[PDB]
Design an enzyme around this catalytic site. Structure first.
Site, PDB file in Angstrom:
ATOM      1  N   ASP A   1       0.824  -1.196   0.000  1.00 19.65           N
ATOM      2  CA  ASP A   1       0.000   0.000   0.000  1.00 19.65           C
ATOM      3  C   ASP A   1       0.870   1.262   0.000  1.00 19.65           C
ATOM      4  OD1 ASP A   1      -2.319   1.410  -0.046  1.00 19.65           O
ATOM      5  OD2 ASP A   1      -3.155   0.435   1.744  1.00 19.65           O
TER       6      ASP A   1
ATOM      7  N   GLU B   1       0.285  -0.522  -5.321  1.00 19.91           N
ATOM      8  CA  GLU B   1      -0.716   0.536  -5.431  1.00 19.91           C
ATOM      9  C   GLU B   1      -0.104   1.857  -5.901  1.00 19.91           C
ATOM     10  OE1 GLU B   1      -4.160   0.574  -3.102  1.00 19.91           O
ATOM     11  OE2 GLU B   1      -3.536  -1.052  -1.781  1.00 19.91           O
ATOM     12  N   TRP B   2       1.109   1.808  -6.423  1.00 24.29           N
ATOM     13  CA  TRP B   2       1.944   2.893  -6.927  1.00 24.29           C
ATOM     14  C   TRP B   2       1.187   3.861  -7.854  1.00 24.29           C
ATOM     15  CZ3 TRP B   2       7.266   1.346  -9.594  1.00 24.29           C
ATOM     16  CH2 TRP B   2       7.992   2.510  -9.882  1.00 24.29           C
ATOM     17  N   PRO B   3       0.565   3.393  -8.951  1.00 22.83           N
ATOM     18  CA  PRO B   3      -0.164   4.345  -9.819  1.00 22.83           C
ATOM     19  C   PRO B   3      -1.250   5.116  -9.092  1.00 22.83           C
ATOM     20  CG  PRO B   3       0.022   2.203 -10.867  1.00 22.83           C
ATOM     21  CD  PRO B   3       0.449   2.013  -9.460  1.00 22.83           C
ATOM     22  N   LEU B   4      -2.068   4.422  -8.296  1.00 19.70           N
ATOM     23  CA  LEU B   4      -3.144   5.067  -7.555  1.00 19.70           C
ATOM     24  C   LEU B   4      -2.626   6.213  -6.686  1.00 19.70           C
ATOM     25  CD1 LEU B   4      -6.008   5.261  -6.482  1.00 19.70           C
ATOM     26  CD2 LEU B   4      -5.441   3.391  -4.887  1.00 19.70           C
ATOM     27  N   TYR B   5      -1.499   6.013  -6.013  1.00 22.62           N
ATOM     28  CA  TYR B   5      -0.960   7.038  -5.131  1.00 22.62           C
ATOM     29  C   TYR B   5      -0.189   8.121  -5.872  1.00 22.62           C
ATOM     30  CZ  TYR B   5      -2.667   4.580  -1.113  1.00 22.62           C
ATOM     31  OH  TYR B   5      -3.492   4.006  -0.167  1.00 22.62           O
TER      32      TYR B   5
ATOM     33  N   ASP C   1     -10.611   2.577  -4.323  1.00 19.63           N
ATOM     34  CA  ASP C   1     -11.096   1.308  -3.781  1.00 19.63           C
ATOM     35  C   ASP C   1     -12.516   1.013  -4.231  1.00 19.63           C
ATOM     36  OD1 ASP C   1      -8.711   1.431  -2.414  1.00 19.63           O
ATOM     37  OD2 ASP C   1      -9.623   1.621  -0.416  1.00 19.63           O
TER      38      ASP C   1
HETATM   39  O1  LIG Z   1      -5.717  -0.289   4.726  1.00 22.63           O
HETATM   40  C1  LIG Z   1      -5.919  -1.238   3.670  1.00 22.63           C
HETATM   41  C2  LIG Z   1      -6.668  -0.563   2.527  1.00 22.63           C
HETATM   42  N1  LIG Z   1      -5.812   0.477   1.899  1.00 22.63           N
HETATM   43  C3  LIG Z   1      -5.922   0.325   0.432  1.00 22.63           C
HETATM   44  C4  LIG Z   1      -6.248   1.676  -0.208  1.00 22.63           C
HETATM   45  O2  LIG Z   1      -6.356   1.513  -1.622  1.00 22.63           O
HETATM   46  C5  LIG Z   1      -7.089  -0.638   0.250  1.00 22.63           C
HETATM   47  O3  LIG Z   1      -6.980  -1.354  -0.981  1.00 22.63           O
HETATM   48  C6  LIG Z   1      -6.906  -1.576   1.431  1.00 22.63           C
HETATM   49  O4  LIG Z   1      -5.729  -2.344   1.254  1.00 22.63           O
END
Ligand SMILES: OC[C@H]1N[C@H](CO)[C@@H](O)[C@H]1O
Ligand SMILES: *[C@@H]1O[C@H](CO)[C@@H](O[C@@H]2O[C@H](CO)[C@@H](O[C@@H]3O[C@H](CO)[C@@H](O)[C@H](O[C@H]4O[C@H](CO)[C@@H](O)[C@H](O)[C@@H]4O)[C@@H]3O)[C@H](O)[C@H]2NC(C)=O)[C@H](O)[C@H]1NC(C)=O
Ligand SMILES: *[C@@H]1O[C@H](CO)[C@@H](O[C@@H]2O[C@H](CO)[C@@H](O[C@@H]3O[C@H](CO)[C@@H](O)[C@H](O[C@H]4O[C@H](CO)[C@@H](O)[C@H](O)[C@@H]4O)[C@@H]3O)[C@H](O)[C@H]2NC(C)=O)[C@H](O)[C@H]1NC(C)=O
Ligand SMILES: *[C@@H]1O[C@H](CO)[C@@H](O[C@@H]2O[C@H](CO)[C@@H](O)[C@H](O)[C@H]2NC(C)=O)[C@H](O)[C@H]1NC(C)=O
Ligand SMILES: *[C@@H]1O[C@H](CO)[C@@H](O)[C@H](O)[C@H]1NC(C)=O
Ligand SMILES: *[C@@H]1O[C@H](CO)[C@@H](O)[C@H](O)[C@H]1NC(C)=O
Ligand SMILES: *[C@@H]1O[C@H](CO)[C@@H](O)[C@H](O)[C@H]1NC(C)=O
Ligand SMILES: OC[C@H]1N[C@H](CO)[C@@H](O)[C@H]1O
Lengths: 392, 390
Positions: A139, A172-176, A200
């Site tokens: 994450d 989750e690199w692109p999302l952040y 999410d």
């Molecule tokens: O704290 C866990 C949550 N944080 C990510 C944010 O995208 C969710 O996918 C889930 O893993």
């Protein structure tokens, strides 16, 4: 990521959407994040046909950790909720023929507030490897600088490699990155087996629509980077939960197949309807998702509250999904020239068409000049498989 | 409206949400708006237990009319889609023991563009009565003044009375007035058996939520005027269609019971699942909706993505609904002191509580000191009946 893993989209189960961060094992014992929950889920994954269908990874998300690291500076599982520890849980999961996934965060804390991995990338990677972890979801919370984010994701990828264990690396690199700058997907592919792009998912049709609309809007940017070893991740399957109608569940299954998405269920396998189970274990649709060619599908057209998506498959086959986005009235007829499908290759000189969803039914032979006619339920999808043929 | 009708909320079937204004009888003969559609629904309402459960009114919505009035200025049904005419359709429906509802508009055109009733109120009322119509839904499109809107709804109400036929009068007066002026519900009640307050429903959870939220936000204005002869109408039940999960369908059924709403199904009775049929025919929940006291329920509290609604019933009983509005996670526990329910009388000194939805189960005796604990599915509802032990 060139680790030999995720040659097809990873399939498994992930606790987050259905169970979240429930720490109250006194008042909510059946829903709290604990080793008993994951042991029972592993038992049912074996006994109820999930492993046979291809769901292999049993994944722990956030809120498994103790509030702080141990004396040797290593992460530890919560003593009350995971008394026997991750290594023993991994032994159990492996003994069932399954693989174990775990979660960590690139920054100083996880999104739920537990110890982050910055400053500990190599030791945390080695801890996971010693414990027998087979997949890491990484994450991006509590990291407000792009350089730190990028270096963290790259560093953890290299540390996992250096442990010498085969570990699927889920980023989750692109999302952040999006709050700051557009991601470079070639670099991310270099370092990750799959990557979350968008917000999410939750248990709602609104969420499904939001993910589909974001994916089609950005499809020039993300569709071609996907392939064996590196996938776009549109988040978990929520079929079997509470917020989707049957037609909306069909839509999610069909479109996650079109998108070559990892299939991570987040549901309660102890309480799931036969209909939901049959959809999630649908052999033909899973076969589309897992197609060895590994070419992600895309939105072909949209208009009049209809969408047409298609995905090229191995051996001149194609999958085609038709979505009715009108949320009133009844089934709507949609017709399209089969020559418009599959880049004009699918049905040249002919194709045999089988409907897979909502029900499996052979539709017959269609000549290259033919027209395909279907009726699509509101918020539902018709999923078809087209097999190229010279017969007829 | 004191016509002796709608002493409990009207129950029936209405074509609009599921079948809309489908005029294409060449390619879709089975779903177009035609006398055959209504005959098929009438047959199934008898044969599949709907009439027995209480669904009595088979209602035609917009798009039944011919493009223009006849030579004598009367409305006429479309000659191709309704070849035998409305009076004959009414005869058939009556022969099945059902009642027939029809649609018209207070203004110059109906919302779909067919002849409006402005300038024709008395002749239209007499036509409907001559046809044997038992219910009129009166829409409010193409009406250029608040004065014309009010005067039209009142005039048509009086014209219907003067025909001498018992006709349930369903109005859209408040809905069309609200953007401009707050409605006087005492007046509307004087003229209407039920009244639409809010935007049309569609086949979606978003629509259900918006209707519930509008009703709870405005509840000081609308709850106390409802009662035998005059009901708030939050629009059709869409259970049995495509857009609602099972728990969302449960929520709609439970809350339409709490709200003393008319129960107009808009679905395809030819293609309906066993589960949806059993919910729509749920004897205990319909009995709550149909409670003779006719006191509309209300939202008691909201917080932590939970809502609690309650409704007083005949004989010191109460209905209580608990909604989980959190759309992520799993069944979530909610607890409340039973002394907080039913204004403190429901469970003083004790009550027996039965869960009706999502499944029927007796929960037992609760003392005035007790707390009620339930787990509520995301977007679902738990519906309870409380019986005072005295
Ligand atoms: O704290 C866990 C949550 N944080 C990510 C944010 O995208 C969710 O996918 C889930 O893993
Ligand atoms: C740590 O990182 C290194 C790279 O920096 C990584 O090494 C790479 O491993 C993969 C897979 O183990 C290698 O790819 C193989 O190459 C050989 C020939 O060199 C082929 O025979 C292999 O083909 C098989 O597998 C393919 C799918 O992976 C199939 O398509 C095929 O049908 C065969 O079954 C495969 O292409 C790659 O050559 C190396 N690269 C380098 C530079 O060494 C290493 O695995 C990582 N270790 C860990 C533990 O993560
Ligand atoms: C046109 O408008 C007039 C005026 O509003 C309207 O007259 C009203 O009719 C209702 C229903 O017929 C009357 O209510 C009845 O009043 C008498 C009093 O003598 C009672 O006997 C009736 O008993 C009811 O309740 C019984 C059990 O409680 C039932 O078994 C029984 O069936 C009755 O429903 C009831 O209270 C009302 O008094 C009149 N009002 C006036 C001013 O006359 C008329 O119905 C309208 N006509 C049309 C065709 O719409
Ligand atoms: C709302 O409308 C009602 C009816 O039109 C009004 O109530 C009537 O008021 C008159 C005097 O204005 C009385 O003689 C009647 O007895 C009333 N009718 C009833 C049934 O009580 C009411 O005043 C209006 N309210 C507002 C705020 O305008
Ligand atoms: C964690 O906090 C320390 C001390 O405040 C800081 O130096 C470091 O940059 C933080 N980690 C990340 C990844 O930002
Ligand atoms: C993306 O990253 C790769 C590898 O680091 C690099 O070669 C390429 O220049 C980058 N793309 C852009 C557009 O900067
Ligand atoms: C109908 O149209 C006429 C003529 O344009 C107009 O005078 C009348 O007010 C209209 N009625 C309504 C209710 O809009
Ligand atoms: O044209 C018919 C439609 N007009 C009304 C507007 O509220 C709907 O309920 C439906 O009857």
């Amino acid at each position: 990521l060139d680790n030999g893993l995720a040659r097809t989209p990873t399939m498994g189960w992930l606790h987050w959407e259905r169970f979240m961060c429930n720490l109250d094992c006194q008042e909510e014992p059946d829903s709290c994040i604990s080793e008993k929950l994951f042991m029972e889920m592993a038992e049912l994954m074996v006994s109820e046909g999930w492993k046979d269908a291809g769901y292999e990874y049993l994944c722990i998300d956030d809120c498994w950790m103790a509030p702080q690291r141990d004396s040797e500076g290593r992460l530890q599982a919560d003593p009350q909720r995971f008394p026997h520890g991750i290594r023993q849980l991994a032994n159990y999961v492996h003994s069932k023929g399954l693989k174990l996934g775990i979660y960590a965060d690139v920054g100083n804390k996880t999104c739920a507030g537990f110890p982050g991995s910055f400053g500990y990338y190599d030791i945390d990677a080695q801890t996971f490897a010693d414990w027998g972890v087979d997949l890491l979801k990484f994450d991006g919370c509590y990291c407000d600088s792009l350089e730190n984010l990028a270096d963290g994701y790259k560093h953890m990828s290299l540390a996992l490699n250096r442990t010498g264990r085969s570990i699927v690396y889920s980023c989750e690199w692109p999302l952040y990155m999006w709050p700051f700058q557009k991601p470079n997907y070639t670099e991310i592919r270099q370092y990750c087996n799959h990557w979350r792009n968008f917000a999410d998912i939750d248990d709602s049709w609104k969420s499904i629509k939001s993910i589909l609309d974001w994916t089609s809007f950005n499809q020039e940017r993300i569709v071609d980077v996907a392939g064996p070893g590196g996938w776009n991740d549109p988040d978990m399957l929520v079929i079997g939960n509470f917020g989707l109608s049957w037609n909306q569940q069909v839509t999610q299954m069909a479109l996650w197949a079109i998108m070559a998405a990892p299939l991570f269920m987040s549901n309660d396998l102890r309480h799931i309807s036969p209909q939901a189970k049959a959809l999630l274990q649908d052999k033909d649709v899973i076969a589309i998702n897992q197609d060895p060619l590994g070419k992600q599908g895309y939105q072909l057209r949209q208009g009049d509250n209809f969408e047409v998506w298609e995905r090229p498959l191995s051996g001149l086959a194609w999958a085609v999904a038709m979505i009715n986005r009108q949320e009133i009235g009844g089934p709507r007829s949609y017709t399209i020239a089969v020559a418009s499908l599959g880049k004009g290759v699918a049905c040249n000189p002919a194709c045999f068409i089988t409907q897979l969803l909502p029900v499996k039914r052979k539709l017959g032979f269609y000549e290259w000049t033919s027209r395909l006619r279907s009726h699509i339920n509101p918020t539902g999808t018709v999923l078809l498989q087209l097999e190229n043929t010279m017969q007829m």
